[PDB]
Design a protein around this ligand. Structure first.
Ligand SMILES: [Zn+2]
Lengths: 20, 33, 33
């Protein structure tokens, strides 16, 4: 659920997952 | 050979009036900083 | 309808700005930067 309007900070701090 | 990431709101991949509220005022933002 | 351009990063609700933000004096810019 990501509102696509700008000003939504998307940094490494909001990132918790990785997969291949 | 792909990697799929995950953020707070979901998963991201590689590229192949009644609900409004009040925002903090400048004084409060200065106090927070 | 009401057009909004910001959303709370934690609160997850659209926000309404204050006039002082649009009328930010150079003091606030210098301090926050
Ligand atoms: Zn909030």
């Amino acid at each position: 659920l990501h509102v696509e309007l700008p000003s939504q900070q998307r940094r490494l701090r909001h990132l918790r997952n990785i997969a291949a | 050979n792909e990697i799929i990431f995950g953020l707070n709101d979901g998963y991201y991949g590689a590229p192949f009036q009644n609900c409004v509220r009040n925002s903090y005022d400048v004084f409060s933002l200065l106090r927070l900083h | 309808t009401m057009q909004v351009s910001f959303v709370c990063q934690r609160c997850s609700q659209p926000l309404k700005l204050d006039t002082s933000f649009k009328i930010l004096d150079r003091v606030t810019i210098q301090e926050l930067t």
